[PDB]
Design a protein around this ligand. Sequence first.
Ligand SMILES: CC1(C)S[C@H]([C@H](NC(=O)[C@H](N)c2ccccc2)C(=O)O)N[C@H]1C(=O)O
Ligand SMILES: [O-]
Ligand SMILES: [Zn+2]
Ligand SMILES: [Zn+2]
Length: 241
Amino acid sequence: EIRPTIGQQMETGDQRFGDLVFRQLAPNVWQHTSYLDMPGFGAVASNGLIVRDGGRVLVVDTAWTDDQTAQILNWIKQEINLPVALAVVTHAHQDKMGGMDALHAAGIATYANALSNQLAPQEGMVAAQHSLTFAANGWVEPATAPNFGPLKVFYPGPGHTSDNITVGIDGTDIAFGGCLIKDSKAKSLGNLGDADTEHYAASARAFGAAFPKASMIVMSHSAPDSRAAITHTARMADKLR
Ligand SMILES: CC1(C)S[C@H]([C@H](NC(=O)[C@H](N)c2ccccc2)C(=O)O)N[C@H]1C(=O)O
Ligand SMILES: [O-]
Ligand SMILES: [Zn+2]
Ligand SMILES: [Zn+2]
């Protein structure tokens, strides 16, 4: 099996499919995990979500690469056998947006923060085809997120990057923090190279306040955790100021 250098390991409840791992989180929600092999370091796991909404599927984040993202679509075809309506990607870095071309080739409508689309070319990424915009309190402008079903998109403020967004899954107790949120036992906040160290703590807390009843917090590089992931992330971020 795949034993990443960074990221959660495989546990009971995980399905290996090609080069990826899938884990059911709820009747209608699965976590996708893909792995970047770094020469001399090993594999770095990155997680996103797959959500069934009636007769259609919604995706949060690509895999690291186009081929891995095509494998996600193949898993969906095999295990769910319903079309992917749209994908939302949570900022312009390779773990979240590296597979855009595979989504586009498949005819899937793609959405990202307008700022992520603006940064994408600068980051070696392909922009999403549609831009999300946000209110002053972080909630997505509904006209920019048409037919999103249970996906509730929230921009918490600058943190891991200035463009990072988060997604709650309405009708569940799950919320997705992407790379903004690290697990409750993490020793670091990960890559702070593009981070806003002044605002990170407030942004992490704003994510918590946006989804105050989410009990399962999903994130990019660890297994789903309790709300202690949010509070621990914010406490680490307090030390940056
Ligand atoms: C896992 C990370 C340390 S790397 C990843 C991201 N970096 C990339 O996607 C880079 N393309 C990359 C370069 C070299 C090795 C691994 C990733 C970032 O800068 O936020 N997210 C970071 C994070 O979530 O803290
Ligand atoms: O990232
Ligand atoms: Zn990032
Ligand atoms: Zn990351």
